[PDB]
Write a protein that binds this ligand. Structure first.
Ligand SMILES: [K+]
Ligand SMILES: [Mg+2]
Ligand SMILES: [Mg+2]
Ligand SMILES: [Mg+2]
Ligand SMILES: [Mg+2]
Ligand SMILES: [Mg+2]
Lengths: 132, 101, 208, 260
RNA sequence: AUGAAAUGGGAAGAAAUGGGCUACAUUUUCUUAUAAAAGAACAUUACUAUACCCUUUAUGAAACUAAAGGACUAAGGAGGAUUUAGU
């Protein structure tokens, strides 16, 4: 049996999002890619550095927004610009988000020497694709 | 902190080979030819031997940057097969999909 | 297979299509109309309307081919037919007018009548009854009877020949000897039949 | 071979080289030459040619007579005036001198032909071998060149137009040629730059494929001898099929009909 | 110190067994072409070692590694019970 990235069946009480529901073989078929850069295209360089930066950027956002992330973040690289698009629950006060956005942008722009912007779409609660 | 002590030794091997690259190039050039007297080549053969062993660039091993696994690594991403599959199977690698054909 | 079960085997008979409509039996006439609404398999690379194409000889060629070397296997068959035509022309020229009449100089007709002389009517199937191997007389189909004659020829020549003799020289010498009912391939048929008489009473064990 | 028959019947002296590729490959005995130590001697190749040259020109081997003295060995020599047959006889008797008897024969006939005693047809088939490459190796495992060989060197003189009293008939053959493509037939492609310059000015005679009249004549000849034994061969659809597969090429038609 | 670092070593069978490679050749061997065709070879060393050994070259600081030649030849003459794969 294959176990990779597969949320298993229980008794029909486990909420799963659209991203979680689909196993790896649905990548490029039903669900797209969370990161979009040019480093895995044919004849392109610096794939290892884009991949390492993404791993860190995901751990950073999880810790900086603990319990406030509704789904996995989406990373979009254009030129030297980095764009982080995160679905965030409406738990924290509004002014706290403005603090964490200013902090997380400045800190990650001085760490990777690129302009980094954070895009936050607030949801009332996690969106459930199906109950499995 | 690096992943383990094996990755730490490799990092030092990579930083000492960079310092001695020009030196080991200039000396080794004197040996890889047939135009110079063999006495000079025999003496250059020992000057290169006297350099520290960690300067030698064949003692570098490519290890997974995240788990320090010596074998199973893919050179384009610098990750082991186990670590690569975790990022790929979750949609986190840009443009990597499963191969159905 | 890449062909769906709804595909039909092609019919590569030139005269069949050009026959007058009235000359065709209504059964054949019906099939042609049906085939107009069906899918037809593409013809094989070796399937042609050539007047010189013989299915029996083409099949014998494929049973000699090794590792997909069709050029070599076809060359060996071409050399064999020629070696048989040249062997009968020598005999015909060096024979009296009376003897000349009997001599057959068609290699294609020597091959067909040779094979038919080697075909066995009955074969044997190996059976293990009560932990003992018994072979029961069987009646051979038209397909099994033809296969065995060609298989027995290609095996006598491949193995039981001198080291420096060549297949066009052993096969030609065997087609002609079978054509006269004297060869070792004919002897294999005689042994198979004789054994069936020995096991005549053991056909009951058949379950198929 | 048609020209060699015409001259043979008019009492010409036939110098017919059946295949010239055989002298630049697959030699199992390659000695050195006393006349010139640089050159090599092919004993078996020369001996076979002499035996055939003797048969064809046996009549003229007594009339023609040597104009010089040839010392085969310390104990054996040819006195001036003796019949040319003696030179041929010694070559067959003593294989060591075979490659040199040939050279004497070629030299004598070329010189004496101008005297009006006889005509000389130099018929070399496969002439492109002379000015090409070889597949023979020296004791150092180094490939030899055509000029080095004794038989090749002598022949290159006979195909020159510096004599008179005869005609030279040459033929090109890519079959058996070394280091030439399968689809090369034109004179420069096969002869090369060295071979072309050697033979010019020459008269090129194109041998094409069977024309419609020639194809039918060849088809009827096979039917006249009962060669085409297949039942469908005599029919109009058989003939048309053989015309397509052969493409009117004489060799392809002969091979296809052989199996049929 | 069961932690850290340095230097030098981590051997050996030829013995059983699993898998693979190559060969035992004539539908073959070598050469040119190109798998067409031709010329030679074809049993005592003909077919035939990617072993041992001997040279040269490539990588490296290190050849113990790999490749390319050279000789040298051994065994091998289509493999018992049994067994693998292919629609
Ligand atoms: K073993
Ligand atoms: Mg650890
Ligand atoms: Mg390494
Ligand atoms: Mg071939
Ligand atoms: Mg040998
Ligand atoms: Mg070196």
């Amino acid at each position: 049996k294959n176990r990779a990235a597969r949320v298993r069946v229980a008794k029909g009480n486990k909420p799963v999002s659209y991203e979680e529901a689909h196993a790896p073989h649905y990548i490029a078929h039903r669900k797209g890619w969370l990161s979009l850069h040019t480093g895995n295209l044919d004849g392109e360089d610096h794939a290892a550095e884009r991949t390492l930066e993404d791993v860190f950027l995901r751990k950073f956002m999880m810790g900086t927004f603990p319990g406030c992330l509704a789904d996995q973040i989406v990373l979009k690289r254009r030129a030297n610009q980095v764009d982080i698009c995160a679905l965030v629950l409406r738990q924290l006060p509004a002014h706290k988000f403005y603090f964490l956005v200013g902090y997380s942008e400045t800190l990650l722009s001085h760490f990777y020497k690129c302009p980094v912007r954070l895009h936050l779409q607030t949801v009332p609660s996690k969106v459930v694709y199906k109950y499995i | 902190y690096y992943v383990d002590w094996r990755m730490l030794r490799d990092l030092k091997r990579r930083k000492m080979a960079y310092e001695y690259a020009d030196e080991r190039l200039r000396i080794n050039s004197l040996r890889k030819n047939t135009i110079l007297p063999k006495d000079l080549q025999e003496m250059a053969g020992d000057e290169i031997a006297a350099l520290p062993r960690d300067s030698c660039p064949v003692r570098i091993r490519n290890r997974c940057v995240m788990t320090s696994r010596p074998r199973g690594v893919k050179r384009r991403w610098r990750l082991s097969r186990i670590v690569f599959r975790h990022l790929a199977d979750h949609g986190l690698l840009s443009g990597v999909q499963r191969a159905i054909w | 297979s890449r062909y769906a079960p709804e595909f039909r085997e092609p019919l590569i008979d030139k005269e069949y299509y050009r026959k007058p409509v009235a000359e065709l039996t209504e059964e054949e006439k019906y099939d042609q109309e049906l085939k107009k609404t069906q899918f037809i398999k593409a013809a094989a690379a070796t399937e042609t309307s050539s007047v010189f194409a013989d299915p029996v000889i083409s099949k014998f060629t494929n049973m000699m081919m090794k590792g997909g070397n069709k050029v070599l296997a076809r060359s060996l068959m071409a050399q064999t037919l020629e070696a048989v035509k040249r062997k009968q022309f020598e005999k015909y020229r060096a024979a009296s007018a009376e003897e000349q009449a009997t001599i057959e100089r068609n290699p294609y007709r020597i091959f067909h009548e040779a094979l038919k002389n080697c075909e066995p009517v009955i074969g044997l199937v190996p059976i293990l009854k009560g932990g003992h191997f018994y072979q029961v007389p069987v009646p051979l189909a038209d397909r099994r009877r033809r296969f065995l004659a060609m298989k027995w020829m290609i095996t006598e020549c491949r193995e039981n020949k001198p080291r420096r003799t060549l297949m066009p020289e052993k096969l030609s010498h065997e087609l002609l000897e079978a054509f006269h009912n004297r060869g070792p391939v004919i002897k294999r048929k005689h042994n198979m039949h004789k054994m069936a008489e020995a096991n005549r009473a053991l056909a009951h064990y058949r379950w198929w | 071979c048609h020209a060699v028959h015409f001259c043979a019947r008019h009492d010409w002296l036939i110098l017919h080289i059946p295949d010239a590729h055989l002298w630049v490959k697959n030699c199992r005995e390659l000695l050195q030459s006393t006349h010139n130590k640089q050159r090599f001697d092919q004993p078996l190749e020369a001996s076979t040619w002499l035996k055939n040259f003797k048969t064809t020109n046996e009549r003229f081997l007594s009339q023609i007579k040597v104009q010089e003295k040839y010392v085969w060995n310390k104990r054996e020599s040819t006195e001036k005036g003796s019949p040319l047959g003696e030179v041929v006889e010694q070559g067959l008797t003593r294989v060591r001198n075979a490659t040199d008897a040939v050279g004497v024969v070629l030299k004598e006939l070329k010189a004496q032909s101008a005297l009006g005693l006889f005509h000389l047809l130099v018929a070399v088939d496969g002439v492109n071998a002379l000015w090409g490459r070889t597949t023979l190796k020296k004791e150092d495992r180094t490939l030899i060149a055509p000029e080095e060989l004794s038989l090749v060197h002598n022949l290159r003189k006979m195909v020159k137009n510096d004599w008179h009293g005869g005609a030279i008939v040459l033929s090109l053959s890519q079959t058996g040629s070394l280091f030439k493509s399968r689809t090369a037939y034109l004179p420069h492609e096969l002869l090369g730059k060295e071979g072309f310059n050697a033979l010019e000015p020459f008269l090129p005679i194109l041998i094409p494929n069977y024309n419609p009249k020639e194809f039918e004549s060849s088809f009827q000849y096979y039917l006249e001898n009962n060669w085409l034994q297949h039942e469908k061969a005599s029919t109009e659809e058989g003939r048309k099929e053989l015309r397509f597969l052969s493409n009117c090429n004489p060799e392809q038609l002969e091979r296809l009909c052989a199996s049929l």
